[PDB]
């Protein structure tokens, strides 16, 4: 996160760290949707142009964390993955269209004050909250600057932006499975996701049932916090059926 703040303890209890066994290294963010399921960006596991192709074995999931680097002794839970699932029409060749993956935990995790699942949006929740101008929240342990590393989980609040402005900011071809977020240069308030934040959650709080819902997944951007540039996120609602599907077919 660039221009964010230190999260409060237990502020984002669904936040997960994607962790490389060796070398030990933060791969990305992810989120807990149940005691056995984690949701992240497919570009965190599979990215051929860069020979990236992580398997079950290559990673560890860390839940309940505050500090980036410290082993949070009776707070955090470290788990093994049973299986990875990538959306079959995920487009790594051109625009990261359908940038979403599911991670099935080897064993269910126990909720606590620091570990709690976020809600998946319903059509109605989506419809009412996904509006240009409405602000969502991004959290992560990624870079503080485009070009460093925080000590604690950072948070930033950003407004959803109008599709056209989204479209007009890049040479990349935007799809209906994406949304962009950020402040406009004239707005003079800044912030953004940065390196290492990827695969983390973009969440919103319903003013109706006052529950936290994950609307997006931190997907891609051009630099971090650049003027006239925006962050791009996976539209979680549009890919719900695929999510229900794999859980109904293979899990919890």
């Amino acid at each position: 996160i660039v221009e964010g703040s230190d999260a409060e303890i237990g502020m984002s209890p669904w936040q997960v760290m994607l962790f490389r066994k060796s070398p030990q290294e933060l791969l990305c963010g992810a989120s807990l949707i149940s005691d056995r399921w984690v949701l992240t960006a497919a570009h965190c596991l599979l990215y051929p142009p860069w020979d990236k192709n992580f398997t079950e074995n290559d990673l560890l999931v860390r839940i309940g964390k505050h500090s980036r680097t410290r082993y949070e002794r009776n707070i955090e839970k470290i788990s093994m993955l049973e299986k990875i699932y990538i959306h079959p029409r995920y487009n790594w060749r051109e625009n990261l269209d359908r940038d979403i993956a599911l991670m099935k935990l080897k064993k269910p995790v126990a909720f606590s004050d620091y570990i709690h699942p976020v809600c998946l949006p319903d059509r109605e929740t989506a419809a009412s909250l996904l509006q240009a101008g409405y602000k969502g929240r991004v959290t992560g342990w990624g870079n503080l600057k485009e070009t460093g590393q925080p000590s604690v989980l950072q948070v930033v609040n950003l407004p959803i932006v109008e599709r056209p402005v989204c479209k007009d900011s890049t040479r990349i071809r935007i799809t209906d499975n994406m949304f962009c977020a950020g402040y406009k240069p004239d707005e003079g308030k800044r912030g953004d996701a940065c390196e290492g934040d990827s695969g983390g959650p973009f969440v919103m709080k319903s003013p109706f049932n006052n529950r936290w819902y994950q609307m997006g997944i931190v997907s891609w951007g051009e630099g971090c916090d650049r003027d006239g540039k925006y962050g791009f996120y996976t539209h979680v609602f549009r890919l719900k059926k695929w999510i229900q599907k794999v859980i109904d077919q293979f899990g919890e």
Partner: peptide
């Protein structure tokens, strides 16, 4: 079932330092 209700904030009726910025955008 209990999703999105935070043990240290929602569950005790405490609010985080910037959540008001969100609700106010709506």
């Amino acid at each position: 079932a209990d999703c999105g209700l935070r043990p240290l904030f929602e569950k005790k009726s405490l609010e985080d330092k910037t959540e008001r910025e969100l609700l106010e955008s709506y």
